Amino acid sequence: KQSIHQLFETQVERTPEAVAVLSEQGQLTYEELNTKANQLAHYLRTLGVKSETLVGVCVDRSLEMVIGLLAILKAGGAYVPLDPTYPRERLTYMVQDAQISVLVTQTQWSNLISDYQGQVICLDSQWAKIASYSQENLVNTVNPENLAYVIYTSGSTGKPKGVMIEHQSLVNFTKLAIAQYQITTSDRTLQFVSISFDVAAEEIYVTLCSGATLILRTEEMISSIPSFVQKSQDWQITVWSLPTAYWHLLVNELVKSKIALPDSLRLVIIGGERVQPELVRMWFKNVGNFPELINVYGPTEGTIAVSLCRLSQLTESQRNRTEIPIGKSLGENISVYVLDETLKTVPPETPGEIYIGGTALARGYLNRPELTAQKFIQDPFSPSERLYKTGDLGRYLADGNLEYLGRV
Q: The AMP-dependent synthetase/ligase domain covers which part of the protein (predicted)?
């Protein structure tokens, strides 16, 4: 029975002086991140934030962003990422759809929401007020079935829709991920993606709930591979989490040039696209098996990943096949099925639709009951449970690895 911030709080208890977050603009230890998140959370509580309250977060990547996420969680609310690089109309739509009455933002993003009548907290300008609130951990603000965040994803119907993720599926993912990646207190993880993508949660919580150090990327280091590698080297990053497309760029430029990977880097996690077997062969030819390379798969509706494959552990023959596997379930309470049109399990190598079941599942879509009933289906073979219909085709290989066959 645990929320994501309770996991974080236990870590803070273990290692209060360890560095939690580092950016170009400063750093916070575990104790400092916790106390500041607590101050903001107490404030939020006075603004009426409580379990099930949706709070928008429009912030750039920064120490402030991490404090704000944790503070919203601790207050018992669920955060809705609002990417300040998005146009006004889209952000305003998201704020109206989610009926957000509290917005955590910064002065520079002021005017980004159209005639917003709710409460605004600017983290950069208001910190003196916030420093007047209590630094102590809040208690019992949430249950595991309460929402942690609602993250918007593209609608085919022309508007995006909020995917509602509860603490329990997030905590489950985070614990499975920490064990799978072997994150320890000596790891240094680069935070790469915008929080508008659920992968950022991976980067953030896995890092902070393990006692590792979270390093926030800059805007400049992404612009060229050489700069990305050099900056990573300087920061002694041990874990990269990369969109597959950026990883493709990385392999291309590795081959084109003499660049060596940071000596500190032990793990590269990729996902989000079909991975090119040729680029993988290239990677294994030039890089070898260190750092480890892991391909991760899952929809936002499955709490950020349900399956992984360790690419560095594949035999040459498994690499020379026509598709790089998306592998096996992240854990036992997460089920990844290939099913027929009757929702029946199928024999190996038989193609079918991928459906996800068990603890990974989102609550559903926010304010889209038709789409939710369409996508999240009661399991006829397990009445008390649901399956999420991915729209992904796949098949399980004889060796047990799942293979992605594309979109249905």
A: 8-366
Return the CATH number at 85: 3.40.50.12780
Q: Rounded to an integer, what distance in angstroms lies between the CA atom of residue 186 and that of residue 361?
A: 31
**N- to C-terminal Cα distance for the chain?**
37
Residue 278's H or E segment, with its range, is helix 277-286
Beta carbons within 10 angstroms of residue 73's beta carbon: 27
Alpha-carbon gap, residue 187 to 225, rounded angstroms: 22
Beta strands 334-339 and 376-378 are unpaired
Compute the distance between CA of residue 270 and CA of residue 283 in angstroms, rounded to an integer: 13
Q: Is the dihedral of CA 75, 362, 174, 240 positive or negative?
A: negative
The answer to whether the annotation marks 300 as part of a ligand binding site is yes
379 is in an annotated binding site: no
Q: Which two tokens stand for residue 291?
A: 């750092």
Is position 296 annotated in a ligand binding site?
A: yes
Strand 54-57 to strand 78-81: parallel, antiparallel, or no bridges (unpaired)? parallel
The DSSP annotation for 190-229 comes to: EE-S-TTSTHHHHHHHHHHTTT-EEEE--SGGGS-HHHHH
- Establish whether 271 is an annotated binding residue: no
DSSP 3-state of 26: strand
* Closest alpha carbon to 160 in 78, 84, 110, 95: 95
Distance of CA 173 to the CA centre of its chain: 10
Is-contact 57 69, C-beta < 8 A?
yes
Residue 198, annotated ligand binder? yes
* Closest alpha carbon to 231 in 261, 186, 271: 261
- Mapped onto helix, strand or coil, the DSSP state of residue 41 is helix
Query: Hey, what amino acid is at 130?
Result: I
Q: Say how many domains are in the chain.
A: 1
The Cα 109–Cα 405 span in angstroms is: 42
Nearest one of 275, 269, 308 to 292, comparing CA atoms: 269
Q: In a 10 Å sphere around its CB, with 0-12 CB exposed, 13-18 middle and 19+ buried, how is residue 219 labelled?
A: exposed
Residues in the chain: 408
Paired residues of 328 in beta bridges: 308
Question: Cα 339 to the chain's mean position, in Å?
Answer: 27
Per the structure, the complete domain to which residue 284 belongs is given by 1-408
Expt. technique: X-ray
The H-assigned helical ranges of 47-198 are 63-75, 88-97, 127-130, 167-181
